Amino acid sequence: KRIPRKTKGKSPATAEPGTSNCEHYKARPGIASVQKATESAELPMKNNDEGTPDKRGNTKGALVNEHVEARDEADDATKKQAKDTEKAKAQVTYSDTGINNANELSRSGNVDNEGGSNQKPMSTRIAEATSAIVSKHPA
Amino acid sequence: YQCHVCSAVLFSPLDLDAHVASHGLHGNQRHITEFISSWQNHPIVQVSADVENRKTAQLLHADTPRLVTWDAGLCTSFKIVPIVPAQVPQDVLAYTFFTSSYAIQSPFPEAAVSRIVVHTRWASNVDFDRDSSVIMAPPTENNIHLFKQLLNTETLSVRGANPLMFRANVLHMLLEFVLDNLYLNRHTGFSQDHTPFTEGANLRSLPGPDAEKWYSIMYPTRMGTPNVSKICNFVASCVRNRVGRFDRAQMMNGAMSEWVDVFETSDALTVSIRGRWMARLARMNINPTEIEWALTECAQGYVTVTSPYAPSVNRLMPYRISNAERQISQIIRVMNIGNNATVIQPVLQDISVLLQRISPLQIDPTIISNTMSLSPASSILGKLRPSNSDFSSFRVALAGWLYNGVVTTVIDDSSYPKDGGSVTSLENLWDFFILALALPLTTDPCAPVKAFMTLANMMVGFETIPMDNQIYTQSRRASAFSTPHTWPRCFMNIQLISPIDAPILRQWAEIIHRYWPNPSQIRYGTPNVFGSANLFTPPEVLLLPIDHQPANVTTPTLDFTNELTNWRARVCELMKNLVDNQRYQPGWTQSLVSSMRGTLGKLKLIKSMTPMYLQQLAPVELAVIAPMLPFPPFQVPYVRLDRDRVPTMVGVTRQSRDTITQPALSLSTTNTTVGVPLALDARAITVALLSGKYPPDLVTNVWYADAIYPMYADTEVFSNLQRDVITCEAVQTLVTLVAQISETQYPVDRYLDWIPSLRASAATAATFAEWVNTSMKTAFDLSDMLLEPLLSGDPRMTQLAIQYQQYNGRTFNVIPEMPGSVIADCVQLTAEVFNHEYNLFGIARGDIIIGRVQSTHLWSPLAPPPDLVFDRDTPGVHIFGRDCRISFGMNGAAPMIRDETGMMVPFEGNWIFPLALWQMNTRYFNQQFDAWIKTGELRIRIEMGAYPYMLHYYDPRQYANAWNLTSAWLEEITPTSIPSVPFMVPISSDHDISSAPAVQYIISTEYNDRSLFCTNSSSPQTIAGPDKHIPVERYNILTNPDAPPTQIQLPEVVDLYNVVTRYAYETPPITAVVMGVP
Amino acid sequence: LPGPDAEKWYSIMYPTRMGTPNVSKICNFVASCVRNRVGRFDRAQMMNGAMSEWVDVFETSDALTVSIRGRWMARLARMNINPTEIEWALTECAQGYV
């Protein structure tokens, strides 16, 4: 009865006159197609985690600017839309719309939680700031 | 075979016996949901998505936690370990039954010294390991690894912990302690007993091969009093009739009860935690009748669901929650979106395909060609291009109605006329027709003004309108009107456009004001049992940007009562009036009035059915699909033309209402529109809205029954409800826990502050919250997402809330009233108990006094007498601060340290450091003070508050010297960590012994000898050393005669023998029998 | 600081951060300074999950160069223009044709 885990942690009956299985009816909406569409639409949402820290305290994600991050995510969504529609150019674009949206920010791994850039990760900053004041034995 | 309850066909008798269990019938587990229709033979089961080799079974792609998990072992979480073993001669060695010898089994270790430790779930069978264990070795080992796991990545030592993170580490340890006992006691069977000491008492039997090895640990009374010792006279003191089973339920199951109350080894803390968890789960109980009602109501009346069952009380279906938790989950998901179009794209695309697959509407562009047959007809044919067959834009425009507040859909930039356009151009006229037909279906709030200003731009040089300022002009591009602050005064106040100067333009403006579609609202889902995650709308409402009417297929095509048909007719009439007199088209050498009129008449009188569809059957499909979505609809109100109510910004808030902090606007406020913008194809929307039809033999009942059955058979609403429970609980616990290690306006009782720490900044609090998040995910077996959006910048929050604003400055603020949270309640309880039982988790309060003490006395340095201790009241004491500066002597003088008052003092007497002084100047103070501490007359009281300790027992009949340990500790202290304080305790003996000297240097300053359980447990009495009989205060219901069987003094002392209540439930799958409606 | 050898700057920037175990002159100086004037003490965090827009930090500096750079920043801040002003200027220059 032991249930596994999904992740890792710290380690005279005669046949009565009603029954039959002859399959007379077929649904017009299409049970297989409806189940396929439901499978596609049932999926949970993507986990947008970049900007948040890991165990050691270092933020996750690339070191690119916020606005260029938003632009790249937009046109990647456009490419994925085209791929889903199975064409060469997406017809429902998320990028290069008519709206001027030059102030939009999208969370990236460039900025830490304090509000400073991490060109030198948090663990490295802590380590050097602590090593700056250690001392040895006299002799 | 067949089941006469749900009318399903089986094949084996064991199959029937296993099948009736899902309804509640007994006999003599892989499925999540099991449905069956009544008009056909096609069951649909649903199994978890991680299992292998599924044989034609749908999946459950959700991420449901593991709420219900059972435990069959003991309920205790505190074990007793012997430290210094010892054999002793005895008088009685075994029992006798005519020929038999039964060995004497004692409930406690027969050792010279035995003390309590903390091994969570040391004796427990489990069906699902939550895997968050607080495992503690005995004190003679080193337990420093329990306090150096959270904020110790850099570290100047491997076996040292940072004393500025003790409180954070202890809080995480207590969180894991609570989060590990979230199990559910089980009802393993019993067995009588006829031992002369436990006679006729049903005893519980653990599962497994052996069962009588645990009868000595579970029941301390069973052992008689053969010998004369501490265990013996304790058992003599204890009373008898509290043993085994207390009472049992009246509802049996075969010959086995439902629940049972039993006396046995346990602790009040874990029994209380599990009782509160049980109450929390029972509060969520649901009913198959209510599930029946909920599904039959969500189906909008096309299908009636029924789910039968038998009378049972031990059924547990935890699925009921409050609207506050749904709203908090919705806020978390809205924060997750975070301006990342990649997390919006799949949702809209998949909802689009689902609508396309369950809708009766068919879109063939051949209708336009058949009705048609510079040749304006051929011009519009080439401009609509009916041969193209991609209508994803139409379905996505429909699916975007549910997500007004996060994503806003606008017509493409490329659809507008080239270079602004001119009314003297047939191509631009047809561009305007397509654009005007397509505009009313988008969620852009400036759609009417874009529609007006398109024709206004085209009318330059022929008609004029009043301007607002000296900067802009009538030939400003219609696509640049993307905000409410741009709407022209002439468009708002309609009488400014003079009919003698701008006749066609005033006609178009009046048509926009009068005949633009009117918003409405339909009600969906079951707000009685599924709650509702609507934030800015009432609990059961689905806003729509168009009117909706009851359905029927026998309604005339040309019906100008319909809003969209009326809009098409009005637009065609205005373009006709524009083309009539040729007043606006010089340069046309031939007269095209007849051709233009004929084509516009055909366009107006086309036999499309998309308006009928959008009016009648689209809203019902949206309402049938809404309550089943993973990310439920997030809407902001639709204002038709009232400009002062146009929503323009949506933000999220973390801090409380009565406080002023950094203005930290959410990322969702940076969008120029209200949500992320996505463009659409006006040509595709117009073609789909202009050419559509039904199948010739549509019977709506049959169609929607067959289309609703297979998509409710794969519903994950219940998993989503459980996950919303866990999300709200995690939010509350994170707030309650991060408020302890920082400065925040969320005051909860501050149970432990004697444990030192620092005022954590944003980064430290964020990493701490990350550890908390990861621990909860690991405990509940989640992998997708929980609290991640909250960790993006300053997690020191107080409460969530979401609010938008109108154009005129008014703002609407929603604040879900978060209810109580069982995990946070249990964590606060365990901290309140930690306040008194800190010793058992390997911690001591107060501070240590470092000073040479040589004598032949046996007084257990964890329990110092009053003579050796000094404090501020003590006269002749010197208190030192950060400005402590040493100056060497000269020519025979003595060195001197800088007092706090300012004077200098030699290296003598009693001092009082903070720990920070030593932790700063370790390498210097050590070389300066070593000899004076060792052989001088120097004594220091380093004050720490909390510190982990480590015991070193020795023989009190031989020489001992603690300097080699004391100096090691003092050497190993470092500016970032500190090793566990080494003590030197003597060994107690039941016989008299010689006495030898002992030189020990470190002693505590208050009683820390609380984990000591008993010394010389198998002897009659202790004669030398620390004496400690068995603590009768913890065995209260046994020793104390006039005590109710459930009494617990839990905050002060935790009991080790309680009344546990064991359960045995059944958790059937979601059953339904989908019937059709005539 | 961004650089190869950053360990050598936490002691140059922050004089009052070391310990004073000695009667030497440097320790006599450090034992007189106040304790709260180190590192950052003010910031303007307009946006969540973005760079702080400015900070006030105590650190080893030079009043002359601080005044010079303050003057330079004031001069540059007097020249600042925003997208709305640029939009109005370009529209009025184009005379409606753009």
Ligand SMILES: [Zn+2]
């Ligand atoms: Zn059945």
